[PDB]
């Protein structure tokens, strides 16, 4: 489709909306121009969702509890408020970890203060203090507690910071109050920020006077990899084969100790810029630790990333970098030789959260696929800045896409494959369009690194080329 044609599709789709909604949604849909490096000239982002239009976005609690804190495996995270939020978010996100669940690790459990009417009317601070004692009795190997505030907490004016400071002192325990109520912000995105600031304020400074950690020139931390289906482990393996020492993973398979040891590293390696640029900035301001963005989706980006990271160190690391790249060369070459002929030319449309909608493009292109539309739930303009150069000329961008818009775009563009979330999947399967879950990896993965690329390629192929898709039309119609 031409630029003029895509422009005319955007206008057709917006004809359905009332004036107010139409005027707004026009600002959140654009035809890509890779020349343009100031995205604020072409698209608006990180604004409120228009009421009634079936946004796909979640809330600040999902960004804090579901995303940043939930994965920290040796803490107990309290979903503080009524029962719903903690139940729907219970084990929905495949932030993988090693541990003995219920004993030293607690990720897939749902701890909640289960507010009743009396808690709404008279406040939950007394209940929170009692909850904390009960947690200490029944879960004695927890290494800290987080309090993840649901909508009512701030509305009723509870003082979780007080409870956290008083109980923390009494029990000699890290108790982190997190003001991630879902009424704050417009999306998951503010929940990241809040969660980062909570790490900063209650956890990260704990070893500031402690000089016992035996640091080395090659210490790094993986910042903003939540280890979806093992993604962080298949990233870490490569970094350590290159001669680096991965002191921390934030926060997939993450421990509280490795968060506290992070100010001791030499370089912060940021995968998810959107969710953890805040704490990365802070560590450079306070500890003088530099940070850099990297991408481990597919061989092209992974090789580029390994070489950029190695270039920060000395000749010994740069040499191991080339050893690693030579080792995996035959493996990803074999993947490409097998799957690219099966996928070449196929056109993909993506819709995901704050990073993957641009970060996976390289991986698709390594299999000869074209990303013909992409967009984000909750990205900021700094994300779109990074996107416009990664997408082709005259491709379709969409910010906070509506259910309606997404459907109509797909009907016209007729992609060969869509990569989006669970709320999208069953719609597109009905329409006869191959669909891969690009949050949960469709219970597969990992997709990061060289070992991840094999699975990714397998997965796009098994779905795009599945026999089921030829079968949607009854032979008598």
């Amino acid at each position: 489709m031409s630029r003029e044609e895509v422009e005319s599709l955007i206008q057709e789709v917006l004809e359905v909306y009332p004036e107010k909604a139409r005027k707004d949604r026009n600002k959140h849909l654009a035809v890509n121009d890779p020349a343009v490096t100031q995205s604020k000239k072409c698209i608006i982002s990180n604004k409120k969702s228009q009421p009634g239009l079936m946004t796909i976005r979640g809330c600040a609690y999902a960004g804090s509890k579901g995303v940043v804190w939930g994965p920290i495996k040796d803490m107990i995270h309290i979903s503080h408020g009524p029962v719903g939020c903690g139940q729907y978010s219970r084990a929905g996100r495949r932030n993988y970890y090693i541990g003995t669940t219920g004993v030293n690790a607690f990720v897939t459990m749902n701890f909640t203060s289960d507010f009743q009417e009396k808690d709404i009317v008279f406040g939950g601070d007394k209940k929170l203090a009692k909850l904390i004692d009960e947690v200490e009795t029944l879960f004695p190997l927890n290494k800290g507690i987080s309090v993840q505030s649901e909508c009512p907490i701030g509305l009723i004016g509870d003082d979780i910071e007080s409870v956290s400071k008083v109980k923390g002192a009494e029990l000699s325990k890290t108790i982190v109050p997190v003001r991630c109520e879902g009424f704050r912000g417009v999306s998951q995105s503010l929940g990241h920020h809040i969660a980062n600031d909570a790490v900063r304020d209650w956890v990260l400074g704990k070893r500031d006077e402690d000089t016992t950690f035996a640091s080395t020139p090659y210490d790094v931390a993986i910042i903003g990899d939540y280890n979806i289906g093992g993604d962080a482990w298949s990233s870490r393996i490569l970094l350590e084969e290159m001669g680096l020492r991965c002191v921390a993973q934030w926060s997939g398979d993450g421990s509280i100790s490795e968060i506290e040891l992070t100010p001791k590293v030499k370089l912060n390696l940021v995968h998810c810029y959107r969710s953890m640029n805040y704490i990365s900035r802070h560590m450079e301001e306070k500890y003088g630790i530099p940070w850099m963005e990297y991408n481990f989706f597919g061989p092209t980006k992974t090789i580029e990333s390994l070489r950029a990271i190695a270039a920060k160190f000395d000749e010994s690391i740069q040499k191991k970098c080339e050893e690693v790249i030579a080792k995996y060369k035959p493996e990803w070459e074999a993947v490409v030789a097998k799957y690219r002929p099966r996928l070449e030319g196929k056109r993909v449309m993506l819709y995901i959260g704050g990073l993957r909608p641009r970060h996976v493009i390289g991986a698709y292109e390594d299999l000869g696929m074209e990303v013909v539309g992409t967009g984000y739930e909750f990205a900021h303009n700094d994300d779109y800045d990074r996107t416009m150069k990664e997408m082709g000329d005259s491709t379709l961008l969409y910010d906070d896409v509506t259910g309606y818009e997404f459907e109509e775009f797909v009907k016209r563009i007729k992609p060969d494959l869509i990569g989006s979330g669970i709320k999208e999947k069953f719609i597109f399967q009905k329409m006869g369009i191959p669909f891969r879950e690009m949050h949960s990896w469709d219970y597969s993965g990992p997709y990061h690194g060289f070992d991840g690329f094999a699975i990714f390629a397998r997965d796009m192929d098994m779905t795009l080329n599945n026999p089921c898709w030829k079968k949607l039309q009854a032979p008598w119609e």
Binding site: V83, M109, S113, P152, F183, G185, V186, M431, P446
Partner: protein, 522 residues
């Protein structure tokens, strides 16, 4: 590393020696992990009677609940109406969660909107959200009806739904005649089943309260059926099938089975099937109204009795033999239709299966959980099978319900070793299945973590999960099953007996050790 003709996903990729070594190094380097002996000591302690006593003294902490919040039930109720959009006034984060919860269970699209109230709405309230939200939703998704529920932000700040909807109509955001039933659905009262009741009572009020003058009980010669919160498609289907077989005029009020089972034929159908507005309007003209799940339809019942003047009969959920029989006999009395020879035979076929399977079922011990009506139906059928329902857990149960279940247990020799627990969660149930080990658990997908826990103590302590209830996320298409009527009883019987036999096969699969009992014929 990967080998291209046998690619490994996370399991078993991370069992390769290089990953194993790397993860050992991460643990030892940076995790400051409790020593394994101490982890095993604590684990063993969490299996003890002593730990259970502490566990059962919790007042403030809930761990692994077995309930959800009101608006989830409001949404499911709404989806059961023709061309109806569920609309939850308040916070959008909630609607993303409702949709995905149901998406994962039905493996189907789930359409639901929010009006995306933000922090700013705490000053004013969300009246503007409602006006633009109703307008936007109607124009964009073209429903014939919008059914309005609430998130906890809207309940706490105190938004008057009624006034907001009226002001929306007054100011022309939606037509005066466009149906916009509503319900307050506070997440901090009761559970998802309460949400369902609240929403249905709202829709029923909307269509009938102000047009009662012309209604005559019995004039349409139908029986209204109100299913309540129901996540097995087979359950809507079996009720309609039995009533049609009987020649009984009926109206199923809230019927999502079409919209939760659309064909993959090249188009997406946002709406399918469902109770019509005509059916709701005409429902007071029924002979009577039968409530399939009375223990979460109490508000509905007060309305139907108080306004429609229907003499709602005292029926248990039609689960198992006795209660399906009672349901059919009441329907026969109200409708005047005899129970036909087809249902008589089906009944005898279930009894035949009972006689066939009784020896493997006899005395088997179960822990189970779920919503109150489901749980008491399961308890009832288990006693009918000669099984012992020893741990009966209903997180969202009440005292009256518990008394009713206690009476059911007291009336059977098979109820002797059974306790009913209300307000207790799956971390409580975990203790029970360690300290008073049953043979199996009957429950939803959350129970798989309890089975993992039990196996860790040892193979002889493992308690297998038998997945019946909601949600089921780790098996495919179980939401097509039936639990109501004779058909549902057959399905449950079959699942149970074969779960027993599959387990016996596993324990007797050991060559020259236990395989003397690995019989070809059972």
């Amino acid at each position: 590393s990967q080998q291209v003709d046998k690619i490994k996903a996370s399991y078993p990729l991370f069992l390769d020696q290089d990953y194993k070594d790397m993860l050992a190094k991460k643990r030892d380097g940076f995790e400051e992990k409790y020593p394994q002996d101490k982890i095993d000591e604590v684990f063993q302690w969490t299996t003890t009677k002593e730990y259970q006593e502490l566990n059962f003294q919790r007042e403030a902490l809930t761990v692994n609940p077995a309930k959800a919040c009101q608006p989830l039930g409001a949404v499911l109720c709404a989806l059961g109406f023709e061309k109806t959009m569920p609309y939850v006034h308040g916070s959008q984060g909630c609607v993303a969660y409702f949709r995905s919860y149901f998406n994962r269970h039905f493996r189907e699209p789930v359409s639901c909107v929010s009006d995306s109230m933000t922090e700013d709405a705490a000053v004013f309230g969300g009246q503007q959200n409602m006006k633009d939200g109703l307008q936007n939703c109607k124009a964009t998704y073209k429903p014939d009806m919008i059914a309005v529920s609430t998130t906890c932000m809207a309940e706490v700040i105190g938004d008057d739904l009624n006034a907001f909807i009226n002001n929306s109509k007054k100011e022309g955001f939606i037509p005066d005649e466009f149906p916009v039933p509503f319900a307050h659905t506070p997440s901090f009262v009761g559970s998802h089943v309460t949400g369902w009741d609240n929403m249905f009572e709202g829709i029923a009020r909307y269509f009938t309260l102000k047009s009662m003058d012309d209604k005559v009980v019995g004039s349409n010669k139908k029986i209204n059926i109100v299913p309540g919160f129901e996540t097995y498609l087979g359950n809507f289907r079996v009720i309609k099938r039995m009533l049609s077989e009987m020649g009984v005029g009926y109206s199923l009020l809230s019927d999502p089975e079409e919209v939760l089972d659309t064909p993959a034929d090249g188009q997406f159908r946002m709406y399918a099937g469902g109770t019509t507005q005509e059916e709701m309007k005409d429902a007071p003209n029924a002979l009577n109204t039968v409530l399939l799940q009375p223990w979460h339809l109490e508000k509905t019942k007060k309305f139907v009795e108080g306004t429609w003047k229907h003499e709602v009969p005292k029926l248990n959920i039609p689960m198992g033999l006795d209660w399906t029989d009672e349901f059919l006999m009441k329907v026969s009395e109200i409708s005047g239709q005899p129970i036909p020879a087809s249902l008589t035979k089906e009944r005898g076929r279930l009894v035949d299966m009972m006689t066939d399977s009784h020896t493997w079922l006899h005395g088997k011990r179960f822990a189970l959980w779920g919503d109150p009506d489901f749980v008491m139906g399961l308890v009832k059928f288990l006693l009918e099978l000669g099984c012992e329902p020893v741990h009966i857990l209903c997180h969202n149960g009440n005292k009256r319900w518990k008394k009713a279940v206690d009476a059911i247990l007291a009336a059977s020799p098979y109820g002797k070793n059974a306790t009913v627990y209300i307000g207790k969660d799956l971390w409580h149930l975990r203790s029970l299945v360690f300290t008073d080990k049953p043979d199996f658990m009957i429950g939803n997908s959350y129970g798989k973590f309890i089975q993992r826990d039990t196996l860790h103590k040892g193979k002889e302590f493992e308690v297998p999960l038998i997945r019946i209830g909601f949600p089921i996320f780790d098996r495919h298409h179980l939401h097509r099953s039936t639990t109501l009527g004779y058909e549902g009883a057959m399905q449950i019987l079959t699942t149970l007996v074969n779960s027993i036999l599959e387990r016996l096969d596993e324990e007797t699969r050991g060559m020259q050790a236990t395989d003397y009992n690995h019989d070809l014929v059972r």
